Amino acid sequence: APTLPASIFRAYDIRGVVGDTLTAETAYWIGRAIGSESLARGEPCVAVGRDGRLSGPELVKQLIQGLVDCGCQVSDVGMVPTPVLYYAANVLEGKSGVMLTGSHNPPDYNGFKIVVAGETLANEQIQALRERIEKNDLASGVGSVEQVDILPRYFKQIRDDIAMAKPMKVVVDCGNGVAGVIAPQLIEALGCSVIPLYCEVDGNFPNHHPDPGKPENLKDLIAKVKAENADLGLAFDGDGDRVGVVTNTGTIIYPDRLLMLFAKDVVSRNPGADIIFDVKCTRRLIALISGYGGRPVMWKTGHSLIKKKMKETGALLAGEMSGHVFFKERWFGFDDGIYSAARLLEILSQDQRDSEHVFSAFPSDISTPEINITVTEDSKFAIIEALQRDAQWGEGNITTLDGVRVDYPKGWGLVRASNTTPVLVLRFEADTEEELERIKTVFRNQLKAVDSSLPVPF
Numbered sequence: 001a002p003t004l005p006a007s008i009f010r011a012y013d014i015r016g017v018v019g020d021t022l023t024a025e026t027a028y029w030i031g032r033a034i035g036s037e038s039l040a041r042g043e044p045c046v047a048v049g050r051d052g053r054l055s056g057p058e059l060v061k062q063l064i065q066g067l068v069d070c071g072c073q074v075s076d077v078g079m080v081p082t083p084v085l086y087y088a089a090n091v092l093e094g095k096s097g098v099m100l101t102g103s104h105n106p107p108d109y110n111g112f113k114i115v116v117a118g119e120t121l122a123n124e125q126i127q128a129l130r131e132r133i134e135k136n137d138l139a140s141g142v143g144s145v146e147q148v149d150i151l152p153r154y155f156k157q158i159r160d161d162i163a164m165a166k167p168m169k170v171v172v173d174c175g176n177g178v179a180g181v182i183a184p185q186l187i188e189a190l191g192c193s194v195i196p197l198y199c200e201v202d203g204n205f206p207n208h209h210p211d212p213g214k215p216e217n218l219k220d221l222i223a224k225v226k227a228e229n230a231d232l233g234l235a236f237d238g239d240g241d242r243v244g245v246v247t248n249t250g251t252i253i254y255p256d257r258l259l260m261l262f263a264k265d266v267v268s269r270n271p272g273a274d275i276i277f278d279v280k281c282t283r284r285l286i287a288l289i290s291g292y293g294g295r296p297v298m299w300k301t302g303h304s305l306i307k308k309k310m311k312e313t314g315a316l317l318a319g320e321m322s323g324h325v326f327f328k329e330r331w332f333g334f335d336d337g338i339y340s341a342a343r344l345l346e347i348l349s350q351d352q353r354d355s356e357h358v359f360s361a362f363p364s365d366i367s368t369p370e371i372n373i374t375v376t377e378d379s380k381f382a383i384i385e386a387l388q389r390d391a392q393w394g395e396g397n398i399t400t401l402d403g404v405r406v407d408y409p410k411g412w413g414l415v416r417a418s419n420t421t422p423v424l425v426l427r428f429e430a431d432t433e434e435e436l437e438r439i440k441t442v443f444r445n446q447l448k449a450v451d452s453s454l455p456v457p458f
């Protein structure tokens with residue numbers, strides 16, 4: 001086995017650049033490592049999916065071959081959204097699955113999201129794959145591949161459980177990612193008229209990058225919603241595990257406010273249910289869930305970490321500020337932008353009001369857009385560690401489960417290390433602009449007390 005770069009082995013999954021840190025050979029040995037780990041967990045059966053990236057066909061054949069070369073029975077589901085691969089790993093024989101995807105990143109990026117024997121791998125489990133390859137601790141066998149056309153089953157499973165009470169006209173922006181293979185068609189099937197934007201699968205991403213977390217990537221969606229007098233706008237990220245939302249008047253509903261609507265819905269049928277959200281989400285979500293009799297559970301950012309927390313708590317719903325939304329109620333517990341869009345349309349269609357009014361009813365605070373500070377990969381965790389050791393935050397509820405978050409009577413602030421880029425991520429929100437600035441000042445001073453040279457671009 002060859003020497004693969006350590007940098008592609010990340011906290012949540014494997015992420016690289018094709019031609020640079022990710023080659024065909026690397027996909028092969030990663031397949032070998034995953035196959036070996038699946039077998040060590042008693043699971044010979046592994047589903048494999050890929051997104052609509054240009055490098056998909058080349059790297060996916062190597063991933064599959066690495067798996068068969070362990071003795072694994074592979075189910076090749078072809079080109080699908082990430083959640084359809086997770087679906088396959090819940091409904092086929094095996095509980096293992098690998099998705100070849102570069103998520104929302106530029107064209108040349110790819111990567112692997114990995115489920116082994118029901119468990120989404122993270123942290124030291126991803127490192128353990130890297131280590132198997134270095135040690136040649138790898139299975140050898142004569143496996144097999146069967147092709148499985150799973151998209152029609154996924155389509156029908158969703159369609160048969162969603163009950164829209166009336167028609168809606170929805171603009172759907174796929175960003176030329178892989179969601180175009182099912183989302184527009186499925187949403188129409190639910191009982192909608194659909195106005196497509198960038199729904200042709202095209203790995204060059206010639207229009208805007210499929211990344212609905214950035215307002216600029218929703219500009220075209222907002223304009224089309226308004227131009228066509230549509231009831232809602234929906235945008236999917238490149239691999240379909242994230243969704244973004246805009247109302248009939250063009251207001252962006254950030255995923256933490258989306259989760260309020262979903263949490264009300266899930267808890268209404270499931271008294272006392274755990275509902276998970278990441279440290280990037282509005283504090284208003286804590287009170288809202290508690291008020292409905294749910295148990296709010298704040299947890300680490302990162303899809304794989306949220307998925308693990310789901311298993312540990314029995315949560316019926318989870319969501320991240322990035323728009324990864326995980327339904328366990330009526331579903332399987334994995335993140336799925338398409339399924340989440342279907343659940344949103346079901347709820348909105350049962351309300352006489354328009355989507356703008358449905359969402360504006362919930363309490364709102366003044367929020368910042370994400371703040372990112374570039375540091376280094378080898379210093380970002382130590383900055384956080386120093387804050388956790390040394391910092392003083394004044395009176396507040398301090399949470400260090402991921403970075404440092406402090407919840408004050410009238411607002412909150414967060415600083416944490418990104419696990420996908422060499423950056424500190426900050427968020428602030430408050431009742432008033434005055435409190436927003438008081439909190440920002442606390443955080444600015446605590447960063448400067450650790451390292452007075454740190455940028456404080458806020």
Ligand SMILES: O=P(O)(O)O[C@H]1O[C@H](CO)[C@@H](O)[C@H](O)[C@@H]1O
Nearest residue numbers: 301302303320322418419420421
């Ligand atoms: O902040 P981080 O560590 O860079 O992680 C970001 O990307 C993850 C993968 O989509 C998401 O799961 C996270 O929610 C977040 O958007």
Ligand SMILES: [Zn+2]
Nearest residue numbers: 103237239241
């Ligand atoms: Zn994604």
